[PDB]
């Protein structure tokens, strides 16, 4: 004699916002599943990021190319916040060209059907001479967590360039939840709960896809207590 | 007697972690205990961690 809550409506306020609730809770597991979800979704979600840059004329990080008016040590922290999703692949690898004095926006990465900017208002660098020219090839990978370069390097597999820049690479998709049980009503119940996940992505990820991704890195790691080994 | 002489340089870049020594403007040292996970931190009503 229990009660399972069904999905509700995803009130969509933003881009980057998102409410989705959770309708027909029991007494008690108000608190239960939200914070044994807010801390799946902030740490295990599969996003994609940046992994490695690499310019055209420049050899290290502390450089400065001649034209753009950023060191190359701000070009990466630049790139490293940058959004993207791809559907298709596992990993990818863009392009940027560009000439003329003004601002390089994300927008102007060659276009692929896969690869799909979020954020193409953004802002990389600036170009401050008619004759300049800058023209990377960033790279993107899947993942999740947080794996910074010092320790993708024991996996290097003598990466022999030495024009690669490496950029530490955060995927996350998921940057604050909140959650706030409340006093659900079904017609006929004295005490009925609602969860109400104010979630808030980097554009990237769908809300509803989160928690169904959500539940089952719960849901299929509660086996090994249905079934105690002994 | 010196026949020649070399100079090389390394830009070394090194993050934070347990053991360095942050301090505010008051006097009040501290050396960085632990570097916890981005949700065992204490989040007021927004999901805002400290």
């Not at chain 1, 896969?114 to 208002?121: A, C, H, L, S, Y």
């Not at chain 1, 509660?222 to 002994?230: H, I, K, S, Y």
């Not at chain 2, 870049?13 to 347990?18: E, L």
């Not at chain 2, 009040?28 to 996970?37: A, D, E, H, T, W």
Request: glycine share 8%; with cysteine; charged share 30%.
């Amino acid at each position: 004699e229990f009660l399972k809550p069904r999905l509700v409506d995803i009130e969509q306020v933003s881009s980057t916002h998102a409410k989705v609730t959770l309708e027909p809770l029991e007494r008690g597991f108000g608190h239960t599943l939200g914070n044994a979800l807010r801390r799946i979704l902030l740490s295990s979600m599969p996003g994609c990021a940046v992994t490695e840059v690499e310019i055209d004329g420049v050899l290290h990080e502390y450089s400065t190319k001649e034209g753009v008016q950023e060191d190359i040590l701000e070009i990466l922290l630049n790139l490293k916040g940058l959004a993207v999703r791809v559907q298709g692949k596992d990993e990818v690898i863009l392009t940027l060209n560009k000439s003329g004095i003004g601002p390089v926006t994300a927008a102007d990465i060659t276009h692929d059907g896969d690869v799909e900017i979020v954020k193409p208002q953004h802002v990389i660098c600036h170009l401050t001479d008619e004759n300049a020219s800058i023209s990377m090839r960033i790279k993107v990978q899947r993942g999740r967590g947080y794996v910074p370069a010092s320790t993708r390097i024991h996996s290097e597999e003598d990466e022999r360039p030495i024009g690669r820049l490496l950029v530490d690479a955060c995927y996350s998709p998921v940057e604050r939840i909140a959650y706030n049980v409340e006093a659900a009503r079904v017609e006929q119940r004295t005490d009925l709960d609602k969860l109400v996940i104010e979630m808030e992505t980097n554009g990237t990820i769908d809300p509803e896809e989160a928690i169904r991704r959500a539940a089952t890195i719960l849901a299929e790691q509660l086996e090994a207590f249905v079934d105690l080994r002994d | 007697g010196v026949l020649k002489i070399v100079k090389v340089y390394l830009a070394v870049k090194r993050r934070i972690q347990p053991g360095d020594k942050m301090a505010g403007r008051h006097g009040n040292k501290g050396v960085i205990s632990k570097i916890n996970p981005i949700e065992d931190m204490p989040y007021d009503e927004n999901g805002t961690p400290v």
